[PDB]
From Swiss-Prot:
Family: Belongs to the GFP family.
Protein name: GFP-like fluorescent chromoprotein cFP484
Role of this protein: Pigment protein that is green in color.
Keywords: Chromophore, Luminescence, Photoprotein
Post-translational modification: Contains a chromophore consisting of modified amino acid residues. The chromophore is formed by autocatalytic backbone condensation between Xaa-N and Gly-(N+2), oxidation of Tyr-(N+1) to didehydrotyrosine, and formation of a double bond to the alpha-amino nitrogen of residue Xaa-N. Maturation of the chromophore requires nothing other than molecular oxygen. The precise stereochemistry of the tyrosine has not been determined.
TM segment ranges: none
Cysteines engaged in disulfide bonds, as pairs: none
Biotechnology comment: Fluorescent proteins have become a useful and ubiquitous tool for making chimeric proteins, where they function as a fluorescent protein tag. Typically they tolerate N- and C-terminal fusion to a broad variety of proteins. They have been expressed in most known cell types and are used as a noninvasive fluorescent marker in living cells and organisms. They enable a wide range of applications where they have functioned as a cell lineage tracer, reporter of gene expression, or as a measure of protein-protein interactions.
Gene Ontology terms describing biological process: bioluminescence; generation of precursor metabolites and energy
Expression sites by tissue: Tentacle and oral disk.
Amino acid sequence: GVIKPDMKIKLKMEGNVNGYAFVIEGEGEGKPYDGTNTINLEVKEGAPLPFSYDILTTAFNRAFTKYPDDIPNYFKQSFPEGYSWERTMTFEDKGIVKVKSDISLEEDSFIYEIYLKGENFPPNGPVMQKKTTGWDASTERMYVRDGVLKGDVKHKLLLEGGGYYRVDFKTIYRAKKAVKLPDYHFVDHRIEILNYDKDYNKVTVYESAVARN
Ligand SMILES: [Cl-]
Ligand SMILES: [Cl-]
Ligand SMILES: [Cl-]
Ligand SMILES: [Cl-]
Ligand SMILES: [Cl-]
Ligand SMILES: [Pd+2]
Ligand SMILES: [Pd+2]
Ligand SMILES: [Pd+2]
Ligand SMILES: [Pd+2]
Ligand SMILES: [Pd+2]
Ligand SMILES: [Pd+2]
Ligand SMILES: [Pd+2]
Ligand SMILES: [Pd+2]
């Protein structure tokens, strides 16, 4: 078909967090049916980033999700035409991240065009102070509204020193063609920074995702 068992990844993110502009480019690979993917990121403008890299990582494609055969796959059906998504992340100290991403396909490589805005982060908060230590494993509730798929995550970031920092995710996924719509289901996530140079100019992100009834 169009979605191979091995697919490459290319992306560009143009970002602005509390007024600080930056550009990140990435390349990687994954196994869509296994629900795993790795992306190697480079900061192109804005290095070194003056905020927590964790607020970017979940922006760096649910095509990479293991789906049981009996739950229709909203994301894989959308190709070759593809899909786009938009996300609002609300942090417990009133910081906000807004993301738009367009996911397209060429040959055996996905292409992401990402725009990300962060705002209202307290100067002394864990994001601006770079005091976060990654995301917990999460469960995203997927449900259909207005002919598109929506996703909810009551998430938390882990903090340096053992604390935690709650974040609500709301995502809207929009296929660029008609597909068989699934009903209420869950996607379990695990996302991790595998390695980084000092100040995170070069970072590798790994994610696994599995859907379930
Ligand atoms: Cl492989
Ligand atoms: Cl949204
Ligand atoms: Cl190839
Ligand atoms: Cl918890
Ligand atoms: Cl069941
Ligand atoms: Pd393979
Ligand atoms: Pd290429
Ligand atoms: Pd480069
Ligand atoms: Pd662009
Ligand atoms: Pd805004
Ligand atoms: Pd700042
Ligand atoms: Pd420290
Ligand atoms: Pd809604």
